[PDB]
Nucleic acid binder design. Structure first.
Ligand SMILES: Nc1ncnc2c1ncn2[C@H]1C[C@H](O)[C@@H](COP(=O)(O)[C@H](F)P(=O)(O)OP(=O)(O)O)O1
Ligand SMILES: [Cl-]
Ligand SMILES: [Cl-]
Ligand SMILES: [Cl-]
Ligand SMILES: [Cl-]
Ligand SMILES: [Mg+2]
Ligand SMILES: [Mg+2]
Ligand code: NA
Ligand code: NA
Length: 326
DNA sequence: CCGACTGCGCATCAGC
DNA sequence: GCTGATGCGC
DNA sequence: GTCGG
């Protein structure tokens, strides 16, 4: 939290750009600058000092100079007092309502939690569930509950088939003391890049988790990705736990290392690492790392036997999950 | 200056 | 129905 | 909004 003030500011700016301006590159630029400043081991004394860091330019340096001198950013003060921006920023806090739907709702005069609630018939399924659990989804999950959650998921997956392997990734795998949700990487020997020797692999797991009342709602579901809602069981007389977001990703077993690298994150670490790969003439996704041809076309997938192999290709010293929280 | 900016699954919609 | 674009979120 | 060439 050395520079909590500055990173907060930049994060607020990134949000404004994504949510209100619908300017995706500015959003990514701001997140990048916030992230680099967050890891900088010194209390930033000036914009010029910040500007030394990759991803901080003249505009951000200037904002940092304003923020340091006054403690705030006029630009942000104004954004905050603007009803349309405020409203749009609020509606996007509901899962399933993004920048476009937010602006549409505000046009229609839907702009409060109350409005949303009385106009449920105007929401798609995802949005309806997001409204349902609006409060819960903004709560953090203590690692201690994540551990309980992990135990359930792992045991129920075992019950469906001992050959499944379920791994909890995301912030949990990076060692975080609290998580925004639970991310589960799933593999089965029957699903490889070579074939799918068994159908409903993901469905069967989802069903079992529903059967035991752990998964409570579904945001979306396909053959390889599930997005939904879950809840720990409480005890006699005890208040219930908040409902939690859960994501499950089924990945070809032979592509586990690329998959776990992807699902471990952080999102910015991934973006950073993937960008570096391109600079070294590779492209990395959750399945494969491939070379780029002179033309620019991705070539064939390279041999991968560990996460470190991936780092090796792009000439990065290996970084443990706990050190990928950018 | 200016092109490029990480990479992709699922839901929904237009156009055919 | 399909495909391809766009929204949303990982 | 930033950067590399
Ligand atoms: N934009 C992205 N680009 C690349 N990989 C991504 C991206 N977004 C997510 N992933 C990968 C890398 C992410 O780590 C992983 C899970 O995405 P979560 O949305 O659950 C989120 F970021 P987590 O890190 O888990 O933190 P918490 O959930 O707040 O506690 O998917
Ligand atoms: Cl932009
Ligand atoms: Cl401010
Ligand atoms: Cl792999
Ligand atoms: Cl691939
Ligand atoms: Mg997560
Ligand atoms: Mg997630
Ligand atoms: Na810089
Ligand atoms: Na949202």
């Amino acid at each position: 939290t050395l520079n909590g003030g500055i990173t907060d500011m930049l994060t607020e700016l990134a949000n404004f750009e994504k949510n209100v301006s619908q300017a995706i590159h500015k959003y990514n630029a701001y997140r990048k600058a916030a992230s680099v400043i967050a890891k900088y081991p010194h209390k930033i004394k000036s914009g010029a000092e910040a500007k030394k860091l990759p991803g901080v330019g003249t505009k951000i340096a200037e904002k940092i100079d304003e923020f340091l001198a006054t403690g705030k950013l006029r630009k942000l003060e104004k954004i905050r007092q603007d009803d349309t921006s405020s409203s749009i920023n609020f509606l996007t806090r509901v899962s399933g309502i993004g920048p476009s739907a937010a602006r549409k709702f505000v046009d229609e005069g839907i702009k409060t939690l109350e409005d949303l609630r009385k106009n449920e018939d105007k929401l798609n399924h995802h949005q309806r569930i997001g409204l349902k659990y609006f409060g819960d989804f903004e709560k953090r999950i203590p690692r201690e509950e994540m551990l309980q959650m992990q135990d359930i998921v792992l045991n129920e997956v075992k019950k469906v088939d001992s050959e499944y392997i379920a791994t909890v990734c995301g912030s949990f795998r990076r060692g975080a003391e609290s998580s925004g949700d639970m991310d589960v990487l799933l593999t089965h020997p029957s699903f490889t890049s070579e074939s799918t020797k068994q159908p409903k692999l993901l469905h069967q797991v989802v069903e079992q988790l529903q059967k035991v009342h752990f998964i409570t709602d579904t945001l979306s579901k396909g053959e390889t990705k599930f997005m939904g809602v879950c809840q720990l069981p409480s005890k006699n007389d005890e208040k219930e736990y908040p409902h939690r977001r859960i994501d499950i990703r089924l990945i070809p077993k032979d592509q586990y290392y690329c998959g776990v690298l992807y699902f471990t994150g952080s999102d910015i670490f991934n973006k950073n690492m993937r960008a570096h790969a391109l600079e070294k003439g590779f492209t990395i996704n959750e399945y494969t790392i491939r070379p780029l041809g002179v033309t620019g076309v991705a070539g064939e997938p390279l041999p991968v036997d560990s996460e470190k192999d991936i780092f090796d290709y792009i000439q990065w010293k290996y970084r443990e999950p706990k050190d990928r929280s950018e």
